[PDB]
Design a protein around this ligand. Sequence first.
Ligand code: NA
Length: 362
Amino acid sequence: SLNSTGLAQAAINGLNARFYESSNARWSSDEPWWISGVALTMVIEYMRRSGSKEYLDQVEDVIEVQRQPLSWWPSGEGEFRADATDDTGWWALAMVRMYDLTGNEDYLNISIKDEAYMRQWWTDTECGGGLYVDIQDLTYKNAIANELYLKLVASLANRAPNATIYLDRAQQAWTWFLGSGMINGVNLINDGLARDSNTGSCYNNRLPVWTYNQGVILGALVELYHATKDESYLLSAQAIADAVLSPSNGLTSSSGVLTETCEGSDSCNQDQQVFKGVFALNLAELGDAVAGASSDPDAGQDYREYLDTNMQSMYANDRSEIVPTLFDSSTGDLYDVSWSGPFRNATMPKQASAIGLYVANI
Ligand code: NA
C-alpha cells in the first residue's frame, strides 16, 4: 500500500520547491556544494529506476552550470574538479549514473577526467596507497574519498572504452582498502587513517562509524563483481551490510531503523544529515546484484525488507507536507534527519537523504 515511486517524486518536488535555485542551477547555495551532487544523484537514480524523465531538463541545467570552473578552485579547470577529492568523487559518480540513464558519452567523459584528477593525489609513500581528501594540505587519507574513488574506477571498468587499467586500479584500490585497517573487527568502517608519529605506519583512527562510509563501499564492490563475475566481492559487501543491519552495532535501532550516530545528541551537521540516504541507495544496488547472482528467489530479502522497514518508518514519523497557497501550487513532502524521530525542520541534506531511501525502494 506504499508507492515508493510516487513518494520519491513528492520528495523530489519538495526538494525543488524549498531548496532549488533556478538562477544558480543549484540546490541551496548556503549548503555544501558536494551535497548538490548527491541530490543530483538521487534525482538521476529516481529516473533510472522509475523510467521517468520528468526532471531531465533540470538535471541537464545543473550539470551545465556546475561543470564550469569553480570560483573557489579555478585550477581544477571545471568538470567538477574541486579542492577536495571527495567533492569531485560525488559529482563523478553522479555522471556515471547520468551516463547509465542517457547513454550520452559526454557524461562518461566527465567521469574519466574526474578519475584522472583524483588519481593525482594517490600516493604509495604513505599508508602504502590511498588518496588524500584535502588537496591543499594532504594530511588525511579517509574512508569516504577512497570509497568514492574505488567505486569510480570500478564503474569505469564496466563502461569506459579503456576498461583494462580501470579494472587493475579498482582491484589494487580494493586490496589497499582491505589492508588499510579502516574495516574494523565488526566489519564496519571508521572515518579514516591516522599516521604514526615515529614509524610512519598508518592505522584506523577510531573516529565515528558513519553510514555513508558503509554504503559507497557496497556499490564499489557491486561494480567490482560486475567487472569480474567474482562473487567474493559480493560476499565482502554482504558482510559490511549485515554488520549495519545488526542492532548490536548501534547503526540499526531496536525498531529496525537506520540511525546516524549523531541523532541521539541531535548534533547531526549539514554533512551528516545526508549520510543515511547514500547508504540506502547503495544497499539497494547490493540487493539487486545479490538477487541476480543466485537462482534463489529468497536472495537478498533482508536488504529489501530493511529498506522497506525504514521506508514505512520515515513515511509515518518523519514526513511533513508543504502548505499550498493561492499563488504557489507546488506539492510534495519534506523530511527531517531522523527516520524515526519527529519532524522538526527540513534541510536540503535531510531532504536528499530522504529521496535516496524512496529511490532505494523503487
Ligand atoms: Na598499515
